[PDB]
Short mmCIF file of C-alpha atoms and ligand atoms in Angstrom, two decimals:
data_model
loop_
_atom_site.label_atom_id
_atom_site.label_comp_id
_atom_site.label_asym_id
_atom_site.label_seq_id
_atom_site.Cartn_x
_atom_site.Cartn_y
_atom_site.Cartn_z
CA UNK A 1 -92.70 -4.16 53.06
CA UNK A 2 -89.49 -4.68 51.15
CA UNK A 3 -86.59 -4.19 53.69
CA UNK A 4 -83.71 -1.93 52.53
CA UNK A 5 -80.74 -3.66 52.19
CA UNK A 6 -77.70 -2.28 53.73
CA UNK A 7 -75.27 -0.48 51.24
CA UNK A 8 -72.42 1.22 53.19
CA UNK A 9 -70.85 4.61 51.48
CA UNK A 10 -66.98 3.87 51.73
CA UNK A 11 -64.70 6.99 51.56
CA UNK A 12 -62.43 5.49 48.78
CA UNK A 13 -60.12 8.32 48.57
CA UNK A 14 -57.03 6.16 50.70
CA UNK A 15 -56.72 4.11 47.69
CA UNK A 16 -55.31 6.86 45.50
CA UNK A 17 -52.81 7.58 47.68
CA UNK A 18 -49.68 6.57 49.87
CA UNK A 19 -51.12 5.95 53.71
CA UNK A 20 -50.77 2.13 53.88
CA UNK A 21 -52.90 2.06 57.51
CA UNK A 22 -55.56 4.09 55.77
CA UNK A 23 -55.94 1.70 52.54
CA UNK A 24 -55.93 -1.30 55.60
CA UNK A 25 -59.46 0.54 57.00
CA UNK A 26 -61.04 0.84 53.54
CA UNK A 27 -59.72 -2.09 52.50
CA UNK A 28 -61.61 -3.79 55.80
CA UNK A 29 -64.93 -1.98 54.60
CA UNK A 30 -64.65 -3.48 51.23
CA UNK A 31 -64.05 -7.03 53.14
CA UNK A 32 -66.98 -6.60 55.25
CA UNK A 33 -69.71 -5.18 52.13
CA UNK A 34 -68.12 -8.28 50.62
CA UNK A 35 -68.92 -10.31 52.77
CA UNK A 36 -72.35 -8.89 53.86
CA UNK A 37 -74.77 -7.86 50.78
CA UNK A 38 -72.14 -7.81 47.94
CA UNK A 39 -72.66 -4.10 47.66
CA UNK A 40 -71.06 -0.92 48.76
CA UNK A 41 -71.12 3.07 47.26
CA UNK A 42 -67.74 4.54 46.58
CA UNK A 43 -68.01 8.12 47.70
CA UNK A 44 -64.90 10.81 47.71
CA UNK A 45 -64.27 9.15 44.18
CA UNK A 46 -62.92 12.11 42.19
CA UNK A 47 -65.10 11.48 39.08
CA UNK A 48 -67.37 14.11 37.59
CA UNK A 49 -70.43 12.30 37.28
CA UNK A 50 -72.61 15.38 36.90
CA UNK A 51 -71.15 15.54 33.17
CA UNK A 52 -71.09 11.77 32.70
CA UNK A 53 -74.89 11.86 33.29
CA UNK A 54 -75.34 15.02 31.27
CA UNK A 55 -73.55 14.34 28.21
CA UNK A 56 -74.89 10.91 28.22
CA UNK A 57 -78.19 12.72 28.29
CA UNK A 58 -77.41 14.65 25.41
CA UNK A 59 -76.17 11.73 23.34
CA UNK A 60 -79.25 9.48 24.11
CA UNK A 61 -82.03 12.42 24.02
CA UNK A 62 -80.04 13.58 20.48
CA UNK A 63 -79.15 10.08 18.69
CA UNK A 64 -81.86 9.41 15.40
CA UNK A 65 -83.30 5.95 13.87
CA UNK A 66 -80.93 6.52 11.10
CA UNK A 67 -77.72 6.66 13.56
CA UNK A 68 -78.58 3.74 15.54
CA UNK A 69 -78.81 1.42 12.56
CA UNK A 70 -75.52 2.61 11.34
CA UNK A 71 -73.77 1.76 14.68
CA UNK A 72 -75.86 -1.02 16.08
CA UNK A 73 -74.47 -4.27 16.93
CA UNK A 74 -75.26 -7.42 14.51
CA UNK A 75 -77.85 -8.70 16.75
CA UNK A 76 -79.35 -5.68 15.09
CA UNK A 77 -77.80 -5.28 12.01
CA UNK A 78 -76.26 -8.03 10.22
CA UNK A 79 -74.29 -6.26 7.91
CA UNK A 80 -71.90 -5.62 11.34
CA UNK A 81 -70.65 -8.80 11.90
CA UNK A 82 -67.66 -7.45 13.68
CA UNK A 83 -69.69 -6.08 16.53
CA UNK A 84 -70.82 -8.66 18.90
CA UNK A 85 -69.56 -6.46 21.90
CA UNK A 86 -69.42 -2.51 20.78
CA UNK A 87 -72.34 -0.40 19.41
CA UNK A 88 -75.69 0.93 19.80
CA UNK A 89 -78.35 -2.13 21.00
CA UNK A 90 -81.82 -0.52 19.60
CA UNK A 91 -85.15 -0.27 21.34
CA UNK A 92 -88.38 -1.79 19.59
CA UNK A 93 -90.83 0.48 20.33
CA UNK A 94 -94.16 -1.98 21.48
CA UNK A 95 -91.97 -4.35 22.92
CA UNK A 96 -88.65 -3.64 24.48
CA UNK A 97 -87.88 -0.18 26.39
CA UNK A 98 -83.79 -0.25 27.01
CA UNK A 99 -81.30 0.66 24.62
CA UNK A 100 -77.65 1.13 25.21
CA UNK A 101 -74.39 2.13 23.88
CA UNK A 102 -71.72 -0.29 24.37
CA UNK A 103 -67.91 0.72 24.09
CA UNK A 104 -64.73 -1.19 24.28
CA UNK A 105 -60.55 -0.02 25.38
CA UNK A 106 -60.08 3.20 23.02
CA UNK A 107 -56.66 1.47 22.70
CA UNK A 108 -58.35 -1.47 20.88
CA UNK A 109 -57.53 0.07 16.72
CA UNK A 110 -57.11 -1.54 13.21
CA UNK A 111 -53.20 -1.71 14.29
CA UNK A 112 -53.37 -3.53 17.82
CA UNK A 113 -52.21 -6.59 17.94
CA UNK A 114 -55.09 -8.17 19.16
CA UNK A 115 -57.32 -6.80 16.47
CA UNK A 116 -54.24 -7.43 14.33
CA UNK A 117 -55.09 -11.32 15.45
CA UNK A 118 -58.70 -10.73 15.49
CA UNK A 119 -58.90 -12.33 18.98
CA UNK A 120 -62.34 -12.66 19.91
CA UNK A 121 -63.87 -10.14 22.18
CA UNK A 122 -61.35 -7.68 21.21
CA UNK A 123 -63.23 -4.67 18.77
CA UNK A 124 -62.61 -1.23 17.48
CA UNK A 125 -65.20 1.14 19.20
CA UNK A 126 -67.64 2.36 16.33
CA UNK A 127 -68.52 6.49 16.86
CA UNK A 128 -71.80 8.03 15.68
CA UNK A 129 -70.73 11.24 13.57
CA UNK A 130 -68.64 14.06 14.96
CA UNK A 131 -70.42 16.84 13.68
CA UNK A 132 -73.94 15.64 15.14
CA UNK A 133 -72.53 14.85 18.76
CA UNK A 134 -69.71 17.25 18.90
CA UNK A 135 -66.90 16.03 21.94
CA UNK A 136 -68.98 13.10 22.76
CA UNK A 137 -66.14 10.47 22.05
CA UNK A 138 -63.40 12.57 23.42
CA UNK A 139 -66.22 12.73 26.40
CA UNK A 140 -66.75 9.13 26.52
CA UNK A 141 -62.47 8.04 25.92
CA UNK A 142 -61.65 10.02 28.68
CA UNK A 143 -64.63 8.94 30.79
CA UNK A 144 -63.16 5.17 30.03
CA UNK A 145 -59.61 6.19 31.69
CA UNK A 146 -61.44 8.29 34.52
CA UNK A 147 -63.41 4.92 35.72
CA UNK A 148 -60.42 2.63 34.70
CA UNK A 149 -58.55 5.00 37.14
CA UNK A 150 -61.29 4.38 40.06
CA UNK A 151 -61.78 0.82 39.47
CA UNK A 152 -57.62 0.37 39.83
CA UNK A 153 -57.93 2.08 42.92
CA UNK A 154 -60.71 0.03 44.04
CA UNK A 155 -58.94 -3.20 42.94
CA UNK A 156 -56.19 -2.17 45.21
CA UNK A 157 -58.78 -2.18 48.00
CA UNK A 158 -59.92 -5.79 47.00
CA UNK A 159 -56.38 -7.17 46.80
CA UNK A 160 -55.64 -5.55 50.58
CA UNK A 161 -58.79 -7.15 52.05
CA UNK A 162 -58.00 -10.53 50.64
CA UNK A 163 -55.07 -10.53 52.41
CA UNK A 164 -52.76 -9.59 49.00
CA UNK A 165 -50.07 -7.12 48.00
CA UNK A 166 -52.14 -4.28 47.01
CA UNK A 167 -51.49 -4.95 43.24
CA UNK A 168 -52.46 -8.44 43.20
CA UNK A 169 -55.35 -7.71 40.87
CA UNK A 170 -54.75 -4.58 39.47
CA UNK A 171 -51.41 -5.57 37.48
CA UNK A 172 -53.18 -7.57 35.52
CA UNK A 173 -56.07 -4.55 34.85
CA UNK A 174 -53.98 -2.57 32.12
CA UNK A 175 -54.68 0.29 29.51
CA UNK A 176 -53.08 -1.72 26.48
CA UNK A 177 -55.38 -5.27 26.98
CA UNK A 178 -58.29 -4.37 29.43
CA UNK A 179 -61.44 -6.38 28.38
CA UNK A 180 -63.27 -3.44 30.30
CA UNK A 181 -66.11 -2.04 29.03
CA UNK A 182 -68.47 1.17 29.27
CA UNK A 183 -72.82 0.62 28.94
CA UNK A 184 -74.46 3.71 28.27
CA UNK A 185 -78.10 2.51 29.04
CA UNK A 186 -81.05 4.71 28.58
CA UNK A 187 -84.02 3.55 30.62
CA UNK A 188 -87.28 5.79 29.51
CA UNK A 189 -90.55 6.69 30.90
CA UNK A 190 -93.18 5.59 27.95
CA UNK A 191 -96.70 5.85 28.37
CA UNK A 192 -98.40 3.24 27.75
CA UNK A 193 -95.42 1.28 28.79
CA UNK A 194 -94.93 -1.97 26.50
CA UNK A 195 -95.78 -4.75 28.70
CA UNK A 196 -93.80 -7.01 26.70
CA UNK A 197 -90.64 -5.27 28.19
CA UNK A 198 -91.99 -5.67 31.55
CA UNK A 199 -90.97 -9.84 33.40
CA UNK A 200 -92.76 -10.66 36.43
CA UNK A 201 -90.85 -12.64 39.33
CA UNK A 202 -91.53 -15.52 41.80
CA UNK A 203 -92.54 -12.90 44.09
CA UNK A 204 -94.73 -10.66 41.60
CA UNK A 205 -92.35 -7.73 41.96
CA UNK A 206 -92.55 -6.21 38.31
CA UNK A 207 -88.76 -6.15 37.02
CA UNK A 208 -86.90 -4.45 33.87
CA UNK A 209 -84.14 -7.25 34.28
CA UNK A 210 -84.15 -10.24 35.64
CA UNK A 211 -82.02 -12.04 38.63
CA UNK A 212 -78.19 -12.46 37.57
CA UNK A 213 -74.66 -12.17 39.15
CA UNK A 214 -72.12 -10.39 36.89
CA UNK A 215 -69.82 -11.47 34.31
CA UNK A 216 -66.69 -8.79 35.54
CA UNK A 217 -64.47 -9.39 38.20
CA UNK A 218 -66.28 -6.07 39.73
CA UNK A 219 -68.78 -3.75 38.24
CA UNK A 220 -68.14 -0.10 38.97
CA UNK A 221 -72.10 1.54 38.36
CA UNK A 222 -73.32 5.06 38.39
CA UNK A 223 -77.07 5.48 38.16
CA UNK A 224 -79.36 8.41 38.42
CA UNK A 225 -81.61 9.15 40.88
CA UNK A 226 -84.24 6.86 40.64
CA UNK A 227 -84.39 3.55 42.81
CA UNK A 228 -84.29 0.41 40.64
CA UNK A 229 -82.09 -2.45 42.17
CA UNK A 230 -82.85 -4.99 44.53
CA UNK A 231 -79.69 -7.68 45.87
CA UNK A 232 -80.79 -11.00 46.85
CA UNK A 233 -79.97 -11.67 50.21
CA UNK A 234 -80.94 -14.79 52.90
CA UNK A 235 -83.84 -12.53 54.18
CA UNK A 236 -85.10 -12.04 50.40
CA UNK A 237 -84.52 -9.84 48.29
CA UNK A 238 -84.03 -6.27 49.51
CA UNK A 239 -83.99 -2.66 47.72
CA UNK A 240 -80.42 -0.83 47.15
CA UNK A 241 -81.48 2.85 47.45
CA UNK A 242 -79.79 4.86 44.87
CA UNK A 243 -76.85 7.34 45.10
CA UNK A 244 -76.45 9.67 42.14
CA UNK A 245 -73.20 11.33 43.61
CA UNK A 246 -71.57 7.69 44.37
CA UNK A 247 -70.30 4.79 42.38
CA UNK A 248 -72.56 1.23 43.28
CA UNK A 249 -69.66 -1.49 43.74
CA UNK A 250 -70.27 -5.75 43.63
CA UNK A 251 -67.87 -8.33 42.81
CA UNK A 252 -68.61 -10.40 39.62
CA UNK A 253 -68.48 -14.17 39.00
CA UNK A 254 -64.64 -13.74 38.27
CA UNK A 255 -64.14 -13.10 42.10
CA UNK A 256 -65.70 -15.60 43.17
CA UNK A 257 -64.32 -17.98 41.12
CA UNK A 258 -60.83 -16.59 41.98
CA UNK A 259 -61.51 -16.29 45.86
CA UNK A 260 -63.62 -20.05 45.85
CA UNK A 261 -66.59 -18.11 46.41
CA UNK A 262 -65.34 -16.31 49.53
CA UNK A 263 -66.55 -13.02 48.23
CA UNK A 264 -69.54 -14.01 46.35
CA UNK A 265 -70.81 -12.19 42.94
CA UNK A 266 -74.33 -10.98 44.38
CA UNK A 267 -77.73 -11.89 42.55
CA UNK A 268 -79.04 -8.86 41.91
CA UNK A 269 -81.93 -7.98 39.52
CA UNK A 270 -83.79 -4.39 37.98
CA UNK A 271 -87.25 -3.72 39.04
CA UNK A 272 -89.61 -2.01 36.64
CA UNK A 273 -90.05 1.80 37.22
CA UNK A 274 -91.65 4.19 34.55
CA UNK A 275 -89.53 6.79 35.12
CA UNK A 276 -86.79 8.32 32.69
CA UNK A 277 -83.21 7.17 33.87
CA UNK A 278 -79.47 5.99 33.47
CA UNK A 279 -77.71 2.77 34.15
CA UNK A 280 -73.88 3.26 33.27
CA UNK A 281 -71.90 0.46 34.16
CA UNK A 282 -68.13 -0.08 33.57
CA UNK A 283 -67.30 -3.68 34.02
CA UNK A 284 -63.70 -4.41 35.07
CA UNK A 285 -62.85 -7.42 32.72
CA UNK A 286 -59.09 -7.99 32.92
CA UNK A 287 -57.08 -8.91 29.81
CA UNK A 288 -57.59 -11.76 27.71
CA UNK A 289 -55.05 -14.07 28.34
CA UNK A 290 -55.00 -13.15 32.00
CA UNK A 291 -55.28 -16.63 33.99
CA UNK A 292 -54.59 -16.03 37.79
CA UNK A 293 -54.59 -19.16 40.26
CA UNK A 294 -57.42 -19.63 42.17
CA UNK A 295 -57.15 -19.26 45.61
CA UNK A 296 -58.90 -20.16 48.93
CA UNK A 297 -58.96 -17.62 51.22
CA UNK A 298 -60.87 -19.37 54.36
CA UNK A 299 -58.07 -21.89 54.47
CA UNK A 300 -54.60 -22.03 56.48
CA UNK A 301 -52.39 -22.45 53.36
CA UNK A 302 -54.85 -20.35 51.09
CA UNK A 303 -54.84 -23.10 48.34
CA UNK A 304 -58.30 -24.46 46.12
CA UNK A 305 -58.88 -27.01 44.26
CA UNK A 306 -60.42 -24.61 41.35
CA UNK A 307 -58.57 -24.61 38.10
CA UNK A 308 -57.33 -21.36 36.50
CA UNK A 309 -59.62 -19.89 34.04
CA UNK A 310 -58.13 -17.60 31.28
CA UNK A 311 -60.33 -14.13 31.60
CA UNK A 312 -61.00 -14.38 27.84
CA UNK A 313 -62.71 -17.55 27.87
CA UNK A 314 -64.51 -16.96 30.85
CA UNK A 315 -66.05 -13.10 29.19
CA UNK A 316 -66.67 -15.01 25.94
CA UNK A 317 -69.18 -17.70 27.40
CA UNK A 318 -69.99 -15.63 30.08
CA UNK A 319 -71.84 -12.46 27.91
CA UNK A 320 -73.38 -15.21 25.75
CA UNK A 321 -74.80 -17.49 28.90
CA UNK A 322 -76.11 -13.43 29.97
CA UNK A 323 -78.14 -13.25 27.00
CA UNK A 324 -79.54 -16.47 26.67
CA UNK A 325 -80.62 -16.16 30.12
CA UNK A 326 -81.73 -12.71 30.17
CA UNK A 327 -82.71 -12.13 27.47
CA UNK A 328 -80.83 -9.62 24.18
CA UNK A 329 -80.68 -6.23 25.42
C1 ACV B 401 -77.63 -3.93 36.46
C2 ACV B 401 -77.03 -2.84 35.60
C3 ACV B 401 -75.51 -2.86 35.61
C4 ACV B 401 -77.58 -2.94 34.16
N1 ACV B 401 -77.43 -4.28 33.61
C5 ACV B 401 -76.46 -4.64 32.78
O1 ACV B 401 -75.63 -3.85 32.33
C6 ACV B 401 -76.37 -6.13 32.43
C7 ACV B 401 -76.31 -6.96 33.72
S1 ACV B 401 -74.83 -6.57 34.68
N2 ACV B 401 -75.14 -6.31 31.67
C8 ACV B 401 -75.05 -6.92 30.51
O2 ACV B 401 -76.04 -7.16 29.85
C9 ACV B 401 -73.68 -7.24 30.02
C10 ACV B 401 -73.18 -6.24 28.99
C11 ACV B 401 -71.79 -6.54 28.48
C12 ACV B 401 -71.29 -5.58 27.39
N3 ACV B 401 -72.15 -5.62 26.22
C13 ACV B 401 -69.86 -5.94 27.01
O3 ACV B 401 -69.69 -6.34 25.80
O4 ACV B 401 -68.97 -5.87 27.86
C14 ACV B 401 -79.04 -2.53 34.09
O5 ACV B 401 -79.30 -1.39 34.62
O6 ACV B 401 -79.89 -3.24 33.56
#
């Protein structure tokens, strides 16, 4: 009864490399998702996602009380006042299934100069103990640079199907200032499920999340293999079947204010499933003081009326409006 919503698999592969007329074709399949649903899978990526999903496994399934609490963000704990952004965000068993390990640039340490400044939004990554999750942060830094590699690749594809120089985003997506961030989120099967973690929509459809567009200028997503998200489209909304070998790709709120809502960030929301699963996004946040002019796309001389936006401003208000909408995950 709910109609599948159309989710082309774009061979991404052009982007890495040199063949200008082959970046044009992908980029015209990243115009046309764009412009369609909001949503395409990356395939021919080049990431190993079978050990992304099994060492994140074997952090979640391995991780005690007593190791959350000393990593957990200060919605949690308030003796971590430092970590609005990076840490462990703790189930409450009875009431809320998801938790989720947040981390930050591995560049971002005591000595950078925007910890140095203690800029908001900027944090040093906190690490549960070496010893008890042996390679799991070299795992996880090297896992950030992987995706930060695919998402520049895919930004090139944006900038090309906006009519750009292929770099037109991704200069400004760098390894010393990203605002990028890795979500490790663990969604389990529990029996009886706590309906207190379970919201019920206009339409009755049972979700885990509720309705949202992103705050990223895209979100780069690997999820296992268990259907879960539905887009909002004119015809309602519609299921986006899952892909466990590909990367799920949407423009966030950044690109449409940047484009003048020519590619729009889709609303998009989590049904409920009792199933065991992973939702690992890495949202492509550029650097803080990055402030690009807004342009209009549809129009002859490509100018809009929109006013610049500094990326740092916009991530700030943007993850707090997220969970005062939504809800503190
Ligand atoms: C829809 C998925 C990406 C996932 N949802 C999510 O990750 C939701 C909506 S995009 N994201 C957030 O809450 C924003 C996390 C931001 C992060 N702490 C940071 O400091 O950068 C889910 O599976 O629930």
């Amino acid at each position: 009864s709910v109609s599948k919503a159309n989710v082309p698999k774009i061979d991404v592969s052009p982007l890495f490399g040199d063949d200008q007329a082959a970046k044009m074709r992908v980029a015209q399949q990243i115009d046309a998702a764009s412009r369609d649903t909001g949503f395409f899978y990356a395939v021919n990526h080049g990431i190993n996602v079978q050990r992304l999903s099994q060492k994140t496994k074997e952090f979640h399934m391995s991780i005690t009380p007593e190791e959350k609490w000393d990593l957990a963000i200060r919605a949690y704990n308030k003796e971590h006042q430092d970590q609005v952004r990076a840490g462990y965000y703790l189930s409450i068993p009875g009431k809320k299934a998801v938790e989720s390990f947040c981390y930050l640039n591995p560049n971002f340490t005591p000595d950078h100069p925007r910890i140095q400044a203690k800029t908001p939004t900027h944090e040093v990554n906190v690490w549960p103990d070496e010893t008890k999750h042996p390679g799991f942060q070299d795992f996880a830094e090297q896992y950030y640079w992987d995706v930060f590699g695919l998402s520049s690749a895919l930004l090139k594809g944006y900038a090309l199907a906006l009519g750009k120089e292929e770099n037109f985003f991704a200069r400004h997506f760098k390894p010393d200032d990203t605002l990028a961030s890795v979500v490790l989120i663990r969604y389990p099967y529990l029996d009886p499920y706590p309906e207190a973690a379970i919201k019920t929509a206009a339409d009755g459809t049972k979700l885990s999340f509720e309705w949202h567009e992103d705050v990223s200028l895209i979100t780069v997503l690997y999820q296992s293999n268990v259907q879960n998200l539905q887009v909002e489209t004119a015809a309602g909304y519609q299921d986006i079947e899952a892909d466990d070998t590909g990367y799920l790709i949407n423009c966030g709120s950044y690109m449409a204010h940047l484009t003048n809502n020519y590619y729009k960030a889709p609303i998009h929301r989590v049904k409920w499933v009792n199933a065991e699963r992973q939702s690992l996004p890495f949202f492509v946040n550029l650097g803080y003081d990055s402030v690009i002019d807004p342009f209009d796309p549809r129009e002859p001389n490509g100018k809009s009326d929109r006013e610049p936006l500094s990326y740092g401003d916009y991530l700030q208000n943007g993850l707090v409006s997220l969970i005062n909408k939504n809800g503190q995950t």
